[PDB]
Structures are given as C-alpha cells and as structure tokens.
Amino acid sequence: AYTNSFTRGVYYPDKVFRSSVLHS
Amino acid sequence: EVQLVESGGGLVQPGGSLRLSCTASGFTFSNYGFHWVRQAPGKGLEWVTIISYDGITKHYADSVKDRFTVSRDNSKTMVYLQMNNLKLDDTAVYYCARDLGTYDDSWGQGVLVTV
Amino acid sequence: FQPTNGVGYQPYRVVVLSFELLHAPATVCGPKKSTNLVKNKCVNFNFNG
Amino acid sequence: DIQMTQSPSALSASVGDRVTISCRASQNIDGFLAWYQQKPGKAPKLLIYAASRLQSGIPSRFSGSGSGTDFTLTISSLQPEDFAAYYCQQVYSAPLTFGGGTKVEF
Amino acid sequence: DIQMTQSPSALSASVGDRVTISCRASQNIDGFLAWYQQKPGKAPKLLIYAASRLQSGIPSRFSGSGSGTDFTLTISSLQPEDFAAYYCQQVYSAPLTFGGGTKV
DSSP: OOOTTTTTOOOOOOOOOOOOOOOO | OOEEEEOOOOOOTTOOOEEEEEEEEESSSSSSOEEEEOOTTTEEEEEEEEEEESSSOOEEEETTTTTEEEEEEEEEEEEEEOOOSTTTTTOOOEEEEEESTTOOEEEEOOOBBBB | OOOOOOOOOTTOOOOOOOOOOOSSSSOOOOSSOOOOOSSSSOOOOOOOO | OOOOOOOSBBBBBOOOOOOOEEEEEEOOOOTTTEEEEEEESSEEEEEEEEESSTTSSOOTTTTEEEEEEEEEEEEEEEOOOOSSSSEEEEOSSSSSSBOOOOEBOO | OOOBBBBBBBOOOOOOEEEEEEEEEEOOOEEEEEEEEOTTSSSOOOOEEEETTEEESSSTTEEEEEOSSEEEESSSSTTTTTSEEEEEOOOSSSSBBBOOOEOO
C-alpha cells in the first residue's frame, strides 16, 4: 500500500524564531 | 578489586632450586605485565625480575641475572619465579607486584624465602 | 609507549572541546559580573553572550 | 643502572605532626618515581604514582612532589596507621631499583 | 658508557634453519647499531648498518630489526658460509663498544 505525502514532511529549519517572513 | 597472593617460599639449602608462584585473581592476568620483588630482612626492597604480559620478553636484576628465571602461564594465571644457585644473601620476603610504578600497581602479601 | 621512547613517540593526552554557537538556550555560559535588567531606555545589552 | 636512596634518617614525630621525606635519584629519571608505604609484616602500598597525582584509595594527607632527580613526599598530619617504612622506586629504566627507606615512628 | 650484551652467547643450528641473534643496549642509542660477521682468522664483515639497513654486498637473508635499546638480527635461511662470530656495536656515543660475541 502507498499513500501520497500530501503537504506533510516538513520540520522546523533552525532554532531561530521567525514571524511574518518567508524563509527558504 | 585486584587480589595478589604468593606461595612456594620456604627454607632451602644453599645452592638449592626453589620456585615461587604468584596468584592472580580479580583482573585479566594475560593483559597486564607482571613484576617480581624481594625484601631482605632489615634492608630496602630489591626488584628481582620482570615478565611481559605475553611472557615473550623478560629482564632480570644484575644480582640474580643468569641465576633466577621467570616464567608465566596465561591459562593458569600465575607467574613463576624460578630461583637457582641460592645464597644466604638471597634470603628475602618475595613480593609479586603487577604493573609496578603506575596507577595499575598492586602488591601481593608475599611469602618468606629463607636460605 | 615507553619511558625510553623519544618525545616524538611519547604519549600525549588530548582533549578536544566541541562548541556549537546557537540561538538555542545555551545553558553553559561561564558567567561573571551579572547585572539586573533595565527597560525603556537605550542600553548595551549582553543576553546569553 | 639508576640507584635510589632516601636521604632523611628515621623520624619519631608524634601523631598530628607534619613530616617530610626526600628521595634522590642517581641520574635523571624524569617524573618516573613511585612512593610506597610498607607496614611491617604487610604488603607495600603505593602512595603516589609518578608526581603530584595521588593514588586511588590513598588518604588526601599524602602528597607527591619533586621533579627530575629530586622527589619529595609530605604528610599533612600523622596517625597511628601512617607510621611505617617508606620506599621509592625509579620506573624510567627497564631494571627497577628501590629506595633505601626511612622509618617513621611515634 | 653504553654496555652491549648479545642475548645468545653461542647458538648454532643446521643449514637452512631460521636463526636469531638478539642484541641489547644499556641505554637508548636510537637506531645507531651495526652488525658484524667476523670469521675465525678473517676481517669483520658489516652485515647491517644503522640497524634497519642492509649493507651493500650482503645477502638478502640477513635482516636487522628493532629500535632503541632492543635489537634483533634474523637470518631467513642458514648457509655454510653464514657461520661466524657475530658482534653488535653501538655507534651512538663517542666511545664504541662491540658485542661480546655469538658463535654460529
């Protein structure tokens, strides 16, 4: 059986707090 | 704990052959090198011989050189100090000590040898 | 390793200290001359280094 | 080979009195000396291995000092257990020589 | 001064055997050792120079090993021409002492 990941699979990049910003 | 016991020391005739046994328990005998020491009455201590951990390489003190032989058996966990051409001067309490001069050093109770 | 062996062959005790500089809480600090907090005025502030 | 003698003679200091012995090598053995404590009828006990660092299971009062040829041992306070004949051995050479020894008495 | 004493006083075997002629120094002499092969009524022949290096014109079978105090000479296969008196010499110090002698 296989299931698509959808939008899952992301973890916080770093300890730094970021608000109202788009970070790559 | 490291435990060292000595045996095979007794009164012997001059020129007799007397062999000692150094008991080893509580540690890996094979890994560690072993030394032999003797204490003459009313005198300072006198290191007799050294044997390596494998027993391949051995050194002897100048006084007992070519007279005293040292051997060991890894399976029996014992070091044997064979003594030959014994003399009145040779009379001492023999202490078998493992890894002399280091943190690992331990001292056996000893067995009296008389000639 | 032997006493006879030269300084080049002599044993050396080596301790490698690994430090990560992070924006994490950073418990290990070595603090000295700690001061009370001040607010609403311009100040030079050291917060966890 | 190296020869080890202890310079001080027998000291009969009382309990609680600081005492100091000196061990001198014939030639430089670097920091390769081992201080021992032998009670009569008892196995010797290694007080300090090499220099400065105390051996495990040895009381804090015993101290290791001295570099090169000169070596020294200081006991902060005496006790009945402490009195004994102390001996020092060079470890730098392959053959080992032991110190003459100094008697410690009440 | 440095006192050289070979470990075998006299060891001789049959042709084709593996031989060992150990030597030792009283104090550390680094790699400064020489191995000689003096036959009875001849001139000493330098087998090994600087302990680990074979001298020119010496057979491959001879091999010198060991550093510091301990040294070890090894002959892979014995020969009739191999038998001679063997001497190890310290060249580290200004005074030079030859080894006592091993008879093969």
